Structure 1
């Protein structure tokens, strides 16, 4: 029931916490036989112009997107926002605020970690690959610790020092899921709850009631085909999707080398991508 062919609509680049350029994403997605790809960087549209250029030169269809961190009660929620107006003032202000809060938080973490680990702010910035256009975050601390030889992989770092459980962890303030959904729809976009079945990060998943309230706010779909969603959660989420007539998406959550996730390991079917395009803004020329 996971699509054998289609689009990988959940991919990160150097403009957030992936290791590759938008050109590299488009190039590779084409070579892997994908029907298309989405850019889905954290709290930004910075890679959209590079992604679009690459899509036209390489000839691979492209969905323009963003992964937005949100919160709902105690639950941390990630939302994929596709095909919205990137000059929408409200959504740009919100990304700006989120980015600023996450920068302050990351510097406070590095300052704490620096007391115990061979890590400096410059070491973190050496991991930020697009300068002021990169959404800086936890993965850049993890990479700095890998580069300093504290951990083998970024995964190891998240299991320990950079972990939500550790004494160095500071949480980032995030807008509510209701604020994000209203903002994305306002900007003419399509909003999907990303990996809502994934019990890493959270002590608990979103409930049916939280999801119902997100559907009433304007939620368009659920990412079902994702490695973090176990089988029982995929059936739960497919049931909710069928019931409320929601879109069902999939994606690799590729971060290039920064994660084990493989480009195209999970996909959205062509017909669902059709629906995303038709609901979203016509961005041809912008």
Structure 2
């Protein structure tokens, strides 16, 4: 297989987490770029769903409703994309609330340490959280505060240094397991995809085939293959696993607006695969 030349970008972040733009801007731009549709996929939240739906309806661009869920498997950080699930589901709702509170707590303790050595305060970080309580907070907002304070040129510079996972300031966020996340997403009627699973900058080691097999047995629907973080060998490895188990194969930009170099639409999911996501997920039309 090859990355599709046309289709949907199903991996896009907004101000409701670590992106710089609104759901409306995402939809408007996705249409302008000739995309067939888009998804919102903010971290550990559905807070931008109503805004995204409204935009989609006003601008006339099909939308997938999604969330990027922070998770862990043994010692491996794993991000799970969850699409078209019941947002009022009590298990998934409380798991997100817990992750957001754990994130808040962690990110505050990181800023407390960073402020000993850098000119940043909790309020400078809060200034970078664009939707307030409705924004899922994390390291990008710290990086942004350090750029607003003049310590680094870009958000990516900050991550190369003080905000890096290697640094003495770093704290990990307590996260649910991939087995729990998959059960919750399937419980809520959704479709679950392992995000950029071949990406080494994320982890000391990638998920192994055995860990992927156990997630497939849990109900994993798919693998994000077309992503700038997956090198060629890993794309072939993941495509093979997907072919062997009949998994869906997705692509997306991981756009965060000005927060990353990733271009909206730079990788895509084909129309057939989006069809299938929609058919497997919950009918949210009306809700």
Distance across 2 between alignment mates of 1:69 and 1:213: 18
Residue 191 in structure 1 maps to residue 208 in structure 2: no
Deviations 1:82-119 (A, max 9, x none): 00000000000000000000000000000000000000
The alignment's TM-score, normalised by the length of structure 1, stands at 1.00
Distance across 2 between alignment mates of 1:275 and 1:201: 29
Deviations 1:209-254 (A, max 9, x none): 0000000000000000000000000000000000000000000000
Deviations 1:264-285 (A, max 9, x none): 0000000000000000000001
Residue 213 in structure 1 maps to residue 214 in structure 2: yes
Deviations 1:41-97 (A, max 9, x none): 000000000000000000000000000010000000000000000000000000000
Aligned to 2:51, the other structure's residue is in SS state helix
1:154 matched residue in structure 2 = 155
Aligned to 2:80, the other structure's residue is in SS state strand
Aligned to 1:42, the other structure's residue is in SS state coil
Distance across 2 between alignment mates of 1:76 and 1:137: 15
* Unpaired runs of at least 5, structure 2: none
The alignment's TM-score, normalised by the length of structure 2, stands at 0.99
Deviations 1:168-202 (A, max 9, x none): 00000100000000000000000000000000121
Distance across 2 between alignment mates of 1:242 and 1:30: 31
How many residue pairs end up in the alignment? 286
Aligned to 1:209, the other structure's residue is in SS state helix
Deviations 1:119-173 (A, max 9, x none): 0000001100001000011100000001111111111111100000000000001
Distance across 2 between alignment mates of 1:58 and 1:214: 37
> Once the 2 structures are TM-superposed, how far is the Cα of residue 14 of structure 1 from its aligned partner?
0.1
CA RMSD, aligned part only? 0.3
Q: Which runs of 4+ in 1 moved over 4 A?
A: none
* Alpha carbons 1:164, 1:201 under 8 Å: kept: no
